[PDB]
Write an enzyme that holds these catalytic residues in place. Structure first.
Site, PDB file in Angstrom:
ATOM      1  N   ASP A 295       0.891  -1.088   0.300  1.00  0.00           N
ATOM      2  CA  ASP A 295      -0.254  -0.108  -0.064  1.00  0.00           C
ATOM      3  C   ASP A 295       0.754   1.065   0.171  1.00  0.00           C
ATOM      4  OD1 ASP A 295      -2.184  -1.321  -0.161  1.00  0.00           O
ATOM      5  OD2 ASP A 295      -3.220  -1.230   1.920  1.00  0.00           O
TER       6      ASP A 295
ATOM      7  N   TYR B 153     -11.308  -1.106   1.153  1.00  0.00           N
ATOM      8  CA  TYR B 153     -10.995  -1.530   2.237  1.00  0.00           C
ATOM      9  C   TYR B 153     -10.866   0.338   3.402  1.00  0.00           C
TER      10      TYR B 153
END
Ligand SMILES: *[C@@H]1O[C@H](CO)[C@@H](O[C@@H]2O[C@H](CO)[C@@H](O[C@@H]3O[C@H](CO)[C@@H](O)[C@H](O)[C@H]3NC(C)=O)[C@H](O)[C@H]2NC(C)=O)[C@H](O)[C@H]1NC(C)=O
Ligand SMILES: *[C@H]1O[C@H](CO)[C@@H](O[C@@H]2O[C@H](CO)[C@@H](O[C@@H]3O[C@H](CO)[C@@H](O)[C@H](O)[C@H]3NC(C)=O)[C@H](O)[C@H]2NC(C)=O)[C@H](O)[C@H]1NC(C)=O
Ligand SMILES: *[C@@H]1O[C@H](CO)[C@@H](O)[C@H](O)[C@H]1NC(C)=O
Ligand SMILES: *[C@@H]1O[C@H](CO)[C@@H](O)[C@H](O)[C@H]1NC(C)=O
Ligand SMILES: *[C@H]1O[C@H](CO)[C@@H](O)[C@H](O)[C@H]1NC(C)=O
Ligand SMILES: [Ca+2]
Ligand SMILES: [Ca+2]
Ligand SMILES: [Ca+2]
Ligand SMILES: [Ca+2]
Ligand SMILES: [Cl-]
Ligand SMILES: [Cl-]
Ligand SMILES: [Cl-]
Ligand SMILES: [Cu+2]
Ligand SMILES: [Cu+2]
Lengths: 633, 633
Positions: A301, A386
């Site tokens: 990420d 998410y």
């Protein structure tokens, strides 16, 4: 405030300085093309620790306040990405290219993260030149351009199968204005090759449609014409000033790394520093499936940015209505600073559990206690589907809790074949694919000062005769203790065995003669490391360990890199490299924690997964650091 | 209300009946002597599950409501302890001796728990006939009867080294008006033999004083007279009616076992029962040290009583001021019912963490969420120096969290010799000894009904060619699934490996074809099982497993026994006996969880240890039990 994030004003100054000083033409990154030169981002460059401590502890003047700028040099014979340190703020006068001294050589261009304009151009290509070639098959499955819901694309990564590749499988989903467009897959995925500097040369190298592979969309369409493709129709007490938080008991400096995420520096308990820095380093997810994107995805990420992708905290939902909120400013993919309203929040939480208490029988009249109120520092990253809420909670007894709570929506895959081998069916034609969630933290504890030692304490049973009855034995419980000597000994394998009591300690003891220490207690339900055989696991080799202690080095600021995501086969940062059998006896130590869990989606996950539980992460607990229970105000 | 604990009225009735049916030979247990006959305790006898279910689900008449009475028959040639089922409540007409049918034979007398009058007499003996013989050494160390603090005794257990023994090392501590008397050891311990029915025949079999052993106190004193003993001077939204809790989402019946602790029955979510019963079975602590009590102690708390030893919850500290409190009534060591005010409390807690949430970029205007409010059922056991707060928390998504939080004061030992091998020094002449804390729970899940199967699901990586690039492989993440067949396969070793996703499932699937299920996720930092070589580990053999699934048997109500504590060498209940390779495919299953942690006392534990963290226990989570995220009101 030497740890505070660059402000809107400093961000503008550095930018002005960059436009002025960079000879090669610059383009606003929000509009740049592969072949253009643009400033990808600018943010605070953390200062050297020694200079920062000389300032904080000895009142030496502050270290030059600097910014780090990542520039995409695409307009040249051999494009590269360059990191430039610019400083001293308020008015910069130098621009230092530090790329080679930090990575051993140039940063290849295909490592740069995909730009938003790049995504917008990939989409124009898909909607204007690609999908129409399959209008027939698309009308059949999805009412394409006939009243059906709009379609949208979904990114995936890495992008290819080896270093140099920039080919991404983009999935097609219904833009259902509801909870998760990615909860409605069409079964159509495209491998677009967008490595070329001129988008006009980009192509779709392969297509996946509802279980079958094709060369391109024209082949899918014409075979469908020939009645050869079966198409499934898819339906539907403290204060905060600047970057410092102050409470009767705690004090620390907070911030957000554009790519790294939440971070805290100079944490002090009752005036004494316990840690120089505690910060997020990386967050990742490894997927499984029988469709391209689900079977290939391995996210790191920071390649997108836990700071960049941070969202406004919803008052009353993410934090209490009466919490204190703070803004964040950044320059990523824009030539003008942006501000993220309500990026952080701080508040006091009553755990509803008594902190301390004891009762008794009669005429021992002095039993009771106090409730447990804790201080919370929070922020939230929204990465695609998410939502990651990052917590750092400070207790009144000197303990710190750092947690990750995952929420949001799951990414789905079209269901076909042996799908259940890779997850659970959670809807019609929809599979919820398996994945693990991992996070890595940098914990720079300075227990009782810089020089630290690592202690491993545990229990053991040894049978010994009973003194008052020698004919009988008794499994004697005892404590075992070992001072670890090298980094190799303090690198604990994920899922493996590790001392129950592991702590970092100073040379000095507490009043009772025990090393003053802060122990680390990890809390996770991680899923099992990625096999080292994977040609890309080195890029997230921090995943090999539950906990690891190494020597704090100016040359090892992070366990990952924004540049790892688009090129994991030849990582820019391989955390395991930091573990090279050096001494860990009496040195500045840094602890790195890995936390995560396995997620096999289930029906309860639809339409959105919930935060039930207390998250994943770790506790930092004082162990003979004090001479008794510390006071509280 | 067939799960409700006996009320003050029923308790009185059963007692009257027992006095009437057992005649003259009865003495109030509050004043009984070893040789007397007395009613030790009376409480609810849980009903047969089939009859209870026929009543709750099919409207059959309720089962006879009965009480279980434990009588100490010491006034006879062969004393024994007897269990009598007394019933039907309100007006009993029968008294059934079920001792032999539940244990295979008579309960030997030395298994009975030590009576309070027994402790009081042991104390009269110690203070009137023993310590004065060592007045000289005691004047020196402790200003005994010369203005120094009063002394008091501390129990320990088991009591001996083999079945039949009732010899207990009692320690001597300063009785300080402050933070715990057991934090001030004198270094004096006495092994008193109190097995004899006539207290007049009791004796001290050995004495320990500051590191050395002696035959008796006269020897300690005379050797000290002889200038041979060096003496160290020691300084200083819902409602609750009857036994049922009702909320928009949940419904269950609560209670407290006199020896077993908190318990809950008939737990229903949105009208559907998830579990017939979830209850505490046992709590224990294993100690280490180089002083008698610390090296010998192995507690199985039900021997004293998590219910009996339950304390009043402090409003504002243990539970919020505005929580709902409930009383408990019991008859233990008294012939008249006692009521424990505020034994339970129920309230709604805001975890301060958003339950669900997702955000986005622009003009997708529909992002947000709701805060996470949870229902808590709480009670607290105060066992000597420890305080154990038992929590059962019900989430709005169908999940249940069961936790143990330990607080209170640590028991200390006089410091000498190799003390640090068994703990940490936490004061002057004081060692805080190592120990483990364990708890065992009975979780009778009835997933989608009685007939259940156990599923073990996990992850695995298998390298597979990449379809769109066959020359390349990829570590393919996938789910593995195995239906367990026998109890042996579902008995997971503590600290060992166990499936990441373990759940009990019904025969019926949810809408998507997956077995409806509730998984168990344990949360502990247990210390390592007692070696099976210990002649007493069978008494707490539940400690061998992290989790175990067996067939629910009327004959196996509990994993421990009030009678194990005073006789672990020949346990009255050996949990491992329940694991005998029977089928677990399609039967009424019961899950038993063990949770605990290692505790090496440290300075921060003085004067009282705190509850920092989220305790130890487990989560019960819905896994494809619903067809989507359940609704919430
Ligand atoms: C543990 O102790 C118990 C208490 O003494 C024993 O139970 C008692 O056993 C007595 C002897 O068998 C019984 O006495 C009988 O009672 C009947 C009916 O009341 C009388 O008519 C009989 O005369 C008498 N039996 C004779 C002739 O000796 C008691 O009824 C009984 N008491 C209770 C409350 O059960 C247990 O037997 C002993 N346990 C074991 C396993 O040995
Ligand atoms: C890829 O990224 C950068 C973008 O081109 C390269 O850096 C540039 O290298 C140029 C030549 O190597 C430099 O030009 C020099 O500029 C000075 C002015 O200060 C002139 O007088 C010199 O004649 C000219 N030549 C040299 C070799 O000095 C650029 O100044 C320089 N730009 C920056 C920001 O450093 C990187 O070299 C390249 N990366 C790697 C590792 O190859
Ligand atoms: C301890 O001291 C207090 C104060 O007198 C007294 O109530 C108590 O009974 C003493 N002994 C014990 C064992 O509690
Ligand atoms: C690390 O060094 C120690 C000696 O200091 C040696 O015994 C050990 O085997 C070394 N480990 C590695 C990684 O070679
Ligand atoms: C069950 O396990 C036992 C030992 O744990 C073994 O002896 C027996 O053969 C096994 N029987 C089964 C379930 O096949
Ligand atoms: Ca190193
Ligand atoms: Ca350090
Ligand atoms: Ca069995
Ligand atoms: Ca069951
Ligand atoms: Cl702590
Ligand atoms: Cl892989
Ligand atoms: Cl859940
Ligand atoms: Cu997930
Ligand atoms: Cu403890």
């Amino acid at each position: 405030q030497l740890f505070a994030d660059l402000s809107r004003e400093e961000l503008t100054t550095v930018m002005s300085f960059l436009t002025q000083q960079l000879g090669p033409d610059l383009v606003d990154a929000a509009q740049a093309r592969p072949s253009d030169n643009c400033v990808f981002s600018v943010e605070l460059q953390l200062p050297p620790k020694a200079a920062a401590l000389a300032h904080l502890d000895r009142g030496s003047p502050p270290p030059a306040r600097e910014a780090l700028a990542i520039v995409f040099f695409g307009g040249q014979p051999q494009p590269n990405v360059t990191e430039l340190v610019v400083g001293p703020l308020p008015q910069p006068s130098y621009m230092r290219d530090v790329t080679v001294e930090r990575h051993g050589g140039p940063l290849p261009y295909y490592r740069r993260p995909v730009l938003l304009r790049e995504y917008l151009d990939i989409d124009q290509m898909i909607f204007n030149r690609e999908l129409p070639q399959a209008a027939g098959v698309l009308h059949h499955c999805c009412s394409y351009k006939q009243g059906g819901q709009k379609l949208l694309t979904m990114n995936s990564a890495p992008r290819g199968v080896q270093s140099g590749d920039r080919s991404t499988w983009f999935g097609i989903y219904y833009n259902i204005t509801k909870g998760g467009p990615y909860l409605h897959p069409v079964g159509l995925e495209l491998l677009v090759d967008h490595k070329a500097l001129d988008p006009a040369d980009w192509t779709v190298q392969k297509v996946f449609f509802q279980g079958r592979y094709y060369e391109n969309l024209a082949q899918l369409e014409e075979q469908f014409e020939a009645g050869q493709v079966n198409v499934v129709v898819i339906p539907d007490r403290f204060s905060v000033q600047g970057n410092r938080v102050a409470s009767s008991l705690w004090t620390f400096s907070f911030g957000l790394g554009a790519f790294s995420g939440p971070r805290v520096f100079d944490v002090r308990f009752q005036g004494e520093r316990l840690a120089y820095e505690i910060s997020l380093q990386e967050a990742g997810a490894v997927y499984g499936g029988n469709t391209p994107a689900a079977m290939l995805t391995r996210y790191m990420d920071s390649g997108f940015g836990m700071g960049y992708f941070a969202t406004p905290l919803i008052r009353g939902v993410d934090c209490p209505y009466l919490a204190t909120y703070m803004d964040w400013h950044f320059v990523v993919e824009s030539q003008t600073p942006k501000t993220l309203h309500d990026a952080f929040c701080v508040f006091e939480q009553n755990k509803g559990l008594p902190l301390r208490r004891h009762h008794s029988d009669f005429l021992s009249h002095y039993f009771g206690g106090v409730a447990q109120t804790v201080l919370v520092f929070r922020s939230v990253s929204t990465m695609l589907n998410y939502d990651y809420v990052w917590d750092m909670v400070f207790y009144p007894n000197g303990a710190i809790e750092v947690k990750l709570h995952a929420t949001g929506y799951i990414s789905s895959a079209f269901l076909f074949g042996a799908a259940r081998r890779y997850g659970n069916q959670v809807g019609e034609h929809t599979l919820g694919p398996v994945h693990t969630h991992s996070a890595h933290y940098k914990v720079d504890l300075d227990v009782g000062g810089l020089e630290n030692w690592v202690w491993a304490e545990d229990m053991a049973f040894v049978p010994t005769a009973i003194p008052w009855s020698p004919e009988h034995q008794i499994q004697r419980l005892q404590v075992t203790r070992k001072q670890l000597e090298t980094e190799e000994q303090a690198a604990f394998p994920l899922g493996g065995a590790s001392p129950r009591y592991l702590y970092l300690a100073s040379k000095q003891s507490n009043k009772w003669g025990h090393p003053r220490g802060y122990r680390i207690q990890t809390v996770s339900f991680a899923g099992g490391p990625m096999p080292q055989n994977s040609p890309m696991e080195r890029a997230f080799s921090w995943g090999r360990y539950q906990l690891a202690i190494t020597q704090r080095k100016e040359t090892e600021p992070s366990s990952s890199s924004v540049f790892n995501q688009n090129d994991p086969w030849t990582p820019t940062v391989d955390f395991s490299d930091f573990i090279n059998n050096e001494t860990i006896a009496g040195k500045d130590l840094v602890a790195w924690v890995t936390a995560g869990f396995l997620h096999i989606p289930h029906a309860e996950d639809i339409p959105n997964t919930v935060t039930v539980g207390n998250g994943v992460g770790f506790f930092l607990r004082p162990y003979n650091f004090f001479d008794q229970e510390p006071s509280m105000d």
